[PDB]
């Protein structure tokens, strides 16, 4: 099964967003081969923010 799809519009937009926001300041951990848990935490943060 597959939950995320990095080839869509909003996922690719967020991908480019974090790629641009990482060249200036180094992130704590690398972002190569991302897992579904990262996307789940992102969606949870967005849910909390919208609520």
């Amino acid at each position, epitope marked *: 099964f597959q939950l995320v799809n990095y080839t869509d519009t909003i996922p690719a937009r967020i991908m*480019q967003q974090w*790629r*641009t926001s*990482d*060249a*200036r*300041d*180094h*992130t*704590r951990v*690398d*972002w*190569k081969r991302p897992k579904y848990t990262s996307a789940l935490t992102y969606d949870g943060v967005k849910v909390m923010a919208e609520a």
Partner: single-chain antibody
Amino acid sequence: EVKLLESGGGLVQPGGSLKLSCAASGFDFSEYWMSWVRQAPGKGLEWIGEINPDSSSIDYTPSLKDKIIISRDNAKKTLYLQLSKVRSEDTALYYCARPRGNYVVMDYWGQGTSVTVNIVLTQSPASLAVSLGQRATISCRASESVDSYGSSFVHWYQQKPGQPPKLLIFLASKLESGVPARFSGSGSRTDFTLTIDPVEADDAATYYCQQTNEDPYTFGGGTKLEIKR
């Protein structure tokens, strides 16, 4: 390991436009960022062209926007450091670089070309000489904050005369590929310190400690390393 091969080395006439094309061998740069930073002769580097993996935000320099034209393609993996109406003071050593600002796996600069048209990154010692198989541990002090979430956001790239600057460490917690586990960089809120052991003849170059956590993200003061015998 990506290996960018630059093409178009040589001089140029005045009034035209110098288009420097650098082919990226190994794989494509669609998922990896790109950057074309020029380097002066004997001095540090200079961030002129800022790009992204998919080449979405091709940011220009704050004072060299009219002397550079970013135009590349992620699916082609072939950048083009073009310009328009270059001046006479643009005589430097242009060079490309693979993803280094957001990649610490296999970050390595490009080949480069030759053409003749706060933060105090002070490293110590700037010049030394060690015997064969010896050990050397140089330091690199800074004026701004050097502590960024424990892992010091700084690297150490050594450059030789005529060769491009090759990266050795990354974020003081992961060394570059190719070279073995012989360069250990560290530092705790005081100064970046990188120890190399054992010394070899290939390490006879001019090292430089660069930090990406403070402006500017260019090369440091330069530490010449001579392999004495």
